[PDB]
Symmetry: D2
Subunit: 373 residues, 4 copies
């Protein structure tokens, strides 16, 4: 069969909103690690609206955080359709409306979350989303270091993999759309994108002559970013996670502090699934957890291994309960989440980069020993 | 239900949630599709991409729209919030006195129109399973029913102290694919000051939970969390932000099926984020209704400027009655999955979408993508 | 009063108007100065330029601010609208549920600080006349008194059906500079549904108009227009837009004196638009109180980066008791009209300005620029 | 004595708001001449908010009217701090909540208005405001025709005249501040401003060696327009009228249709005062009119001639009532105001330009004949 996943660059207006929300969160967590943050961003031609509910002792400058975030993305001129130095920044932030052991606090909301891991790649992530991520990240890298200076921030990527008996056979189709300045024709752009973006990223074994390459398929891409389309926080939740390979509970990540289970329980679910796969206990593993508001223990825990489990399924569920703390604040302690580390997650994927806390496999050897070594 | 730790550790549990029409995110979805419906009523070929932001006191309606239609954004917004039920400042939001701002822009060829290419790239999923009579997953179906039942009894005066904002969550137990029962039910509903929590929980169990959840699925072990944190007076936009497209798992299958990431509301039928998901449900439902599988998941993907899908996958989870390769070929030939082919196949150029913006886009039999008029054809074509 | 056409065509008439604290423009002025006061309470040297936009459902607070202070714009705004009286959706606006947005930016040397140059150019006027005990023009004074009396009787429950939005207008007749009587009175006040117009007009005349306007100035000829168009239920921001700086003639002398065009509210004392107007009133009042003229008008102008005024003019309308050239020299030496000299002369670095944002910046004796502590000095210096 | 008045260019953020409000009014009056318009504009870095109440059968595009207005002003690049092509335009426009002869309609609001005229100049306007207006208009003219291309839209002017026995003796001080690009030093700017802006405008008879000239007095003026300061409709009402020489009732002009007496009764008051002065009946003349809401006849009419009347004062008041219709809708008929003619008034003065309806002196000869010819 075939499977397809997509990603977007840091200049995509939805991702601009996600990065602004988490930039505000990082600046608040730098001063107040226990802060409650629920920050929603709306970006359109000329303006950024930053809203939500915030409870903190921190003192931050929303305008300067927003402008710096958009400067780093690359929109610094009206020719690009958006300028961090001259756009409007509006604020509509308000306020948010008991246990002896803080680890026993009930969940601040109901909801369901999923985590996933698979053998297909080295980072234990599905191949389609990983290489879709690496294509848009390579586009930004080659734009910022001056290799292809005519590139502009907004870009999208899509990769279609072919699977046979659960194994990767190759790449069926590639889509790469990138914004650019007026000073380059489409033919030169397609050659440069193939040479400096696609070929360095996609492994040659998976690229045959039957592979379809769609580079700027409709032609010129000069108007981009917030100029063309609205951007809102939390409208890229499948890009942020597994590119559709695994399920999703619906909650967005960016702009939320670690006490929101929509974010931290999904981080912990990846942490569990990755360590299970890293331990050689399964080839593929999906975890579902759910919470009731005001209840500390998860209302449900599902472990699905798609027939690839190397130990019995009842054992795997036992291992998860034995080695992981899935209570809302227990996640925070287990993963050490009260740190300004979240703007870096707001683009190119929350899962797959080994330096995040939920990407450490520091429990894999323990899980091996606890089962048949 | 008080089940201690580690007593039934082997049960397979799955959980889904839903929200009422008063949830701020759903208010944004309803406003976006109400704007869409008003435009399609005058201009069925309009391009609409309407994003709504709702907060305490204000509604921001933005996006890009290309149409000959002439609509009143303020009037459409106030009427939608009126019907939802926010008409007084005691509820935290009033449709008659709130602010309505607009930031709508103006959106920056084939011999056969059905061969037009897609307007964007993307992936979309559809799903069906014979667990319910409407071929939907059980948890999301009964999660939808609970919050719609809450709206129903609030509006007809049965429980007049209810307020629009509400959420529900149901945890089902499965044993080898068949429903065995309900393990946990969550029901949080906004209310007025004229009711205590003990009288509220009794009224919720008698007027909402019991008329909806089958008695055969409720035992001594079922946990019931009705307003688990107590008082719920401040709600709606007063409490939280609402954004179009932030309830996309509520809108589809409640987590049982995967998702491509695209929102539905505010988008005209030429956006494959919405129309191809509707088509994906249409083929998944007709495959299951034809008796060719017990549960079926479909993924389609597109490339901008390309008419044919870049990929089509059918997943049957071992429940197929014919080889899965034959199902893939049947889907490609019996359904037009081209962007403008969907529109003609599902008859989508009509103002029908505001109704979809709350309580689920799938499961209600009067929607075009819920018709099962190809099941006997698919069954004939596959042999059986 | 029914005076037919062309009966008393020779009378000299002058008209002024005022508005209550519930008028949407005045709501914007009060919010701007409430933000200013909260900042000066923590940082007296702050630069503030706060502009407010009020509409149905929302308050937009914008401008440029350079300060070490830390203030809550939302809390300051809600409290100001609370005290004005808009606390329910039946009034068209509620302080507890409206939207508050912020768009505040960050504002793009002398051995003697008093020699610092002005921050902008501009012209400003001050005025005084011995027609009233507070040395203010009669029409604007009693126009202010009428709408403040309306707020007074609304807040203490005397007439509880009143609502905050109200306007007044008084036409005086003059004969060679002395008041002869009142020719027309207009009083429009917002109200609730629980009162008819006939009972409203009687209550307005008994509880507002009669306790304020001296009986000697009311004859058979006086026209009284109380709610002349009838019902006045929708009001405040619900009906109209409100903007900082759109009541600058209400804020000063009601048209009797000229104006430079600069608004007062939202501006810290380093803005000569406000401080030099306050100083211009200070010299005009002390000249009249010293007995050196019966009415006095002062104009000062500035150039950006220049400390001394670019021009100083004293106008006495033939009522001077000493040559007008001597008055100009007295003003230049007895008053420090340099931008930061004003501040020290009037002791302006204090949170006193929210009180000025409704019912007039001039006429209330407890304001610094209303003190008359140089009158005996000016009278000594001029001879008399 | 001395007297001073100021003006601002079309690029001043308050005037940008005034021009946008009346551009919206003009586009509506083009389709619906009887429309009710109360349009308020708020401009800040990156965004335009257009609000108010409108009752019309017209169909207009607020965004395109706004962008075209700012394009004509000259803000078309982020280097200038504002760009008509990429700024945000938000709309918050709503709705507005009987006579046999429409001329007998009551006034839609109470209020007081003033008109003024004087011999000092040819256009029967006070000298300070007229030459302040002509300095900023000359700045825009020389900027747009390419004479001084380094000029930018935002500018302010101020002129201080000296009077002796009611007659002009000369100009005491001049202030001219103009925005500009980075590519010119302050010395070259001051020489070019003196040669191409000040000297062509201010008459040489009034310029002595004692005249003070303040050109960009604090130095560089690169940041300007909405980038530095907020702009709001109706915050330049003294610039719009007589520069402080005459009184003002308080009402703003721009964004209001002719049925608002704040605007049309002030236009008619200038029309009366100008024809009186044009008729040689007085050297200076100020008119005050007032209205009660729902009442058609003005509540008061004052004629002040400052001792310069050539005929008795009681006669002048009679002439005003005899030759002018000051009822709210009667103003509209007398001056033919139901036409899209108002964007041109939103900068450089509503009074002084002879092609406006209220600037015609077509009743002057009649007023002469009705009195002692
Ligand atoms: Mg999007
Ligand atoms: Mg959630
Ligand atoms: Mg939400
Ligand atoms: Mg999409
Ligand atoms: Mg007003
Ligand atoms: Mg000023
Ligand atoms: Mg200003
Ligand atoms: Mg007015």
């Amino acid at each position: 069969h075939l499977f397809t996943s997509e990603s977007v660059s840091e200049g995509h207006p939805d991702k601009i909103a996600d990065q602004i929300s988490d930039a505000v969160l990082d600046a608040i967590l730098e001063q107040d690690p226990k802060a409650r943050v629920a920050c929603e961003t709306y970006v359109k031609t000329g303006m950024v609206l930053v809203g939500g509910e915030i409870t903190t002792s921190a003192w931050v400058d929303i305008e300067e955080i927003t402008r710096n975030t958009v400067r780093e993305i690359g929109y610094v001129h009206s020719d690009m359709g958006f300028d961090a130095n001259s756009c409007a920044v509006l604020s509509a932030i308000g306020k948010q409306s008991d246990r002896a052991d803080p680890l026993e606090q009930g969940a601040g909301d109901q909801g369901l979350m999923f985590g996933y891991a698979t053998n297909e790649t080295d980072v234990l992530m599905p191949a389609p989303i990983t290489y879709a991520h690496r294509l848009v990240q390579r586009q930004a890298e080659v734009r910022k270091n001056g290799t292809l200076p005519w590139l502009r921030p907004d870009a999208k990527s899509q990769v279609t993999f072919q699977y046979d008996d659960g194994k990767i056979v190759g790449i069926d189709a590639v889509v790469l759309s990138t914004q650019h300045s007026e000073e380059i024709d489409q033919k030169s752009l397609q050659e440069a994108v193939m040479e400096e973006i696609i070929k360095p990223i996609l492994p040659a074994e998976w690229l045959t002559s039957a592979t379809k390459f769609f580079i700027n398929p409709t032609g010129r891409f000069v108007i981009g970013g917030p100029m063309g389309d609205c951007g809102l926080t939390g409208r890229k939740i499948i890009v942020d996670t597994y590119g559709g390979m695994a399920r999703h509970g619906g909650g967005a990540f960016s702009g939320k502090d670690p006490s929101k289970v929509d974010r931290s329980a999904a981080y912990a679910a990846r942490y569990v699934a990755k360590n299970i796969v890293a331990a050689g206990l399964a080839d593929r593993c999906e975890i579902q957890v759910s919470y009731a508001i005001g209840v500390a223990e998860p209302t449900s825990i599902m472990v699905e291994t798609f027939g690839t489990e190397k130990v019995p399924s009842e054992q795997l569920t036992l291992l998860v309960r034995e080695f992981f703390d899935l209570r809302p604040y227990g996640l925070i302690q287990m993963l050490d989440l009260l740190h300004p580390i979240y703007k870096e997650t707001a683009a190119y994927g929350h899962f797959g980069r080994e330096h995040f806390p939920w990407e450490k496999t520091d429990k894999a050897q323990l899980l091996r020993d606890a089962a048949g070594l």
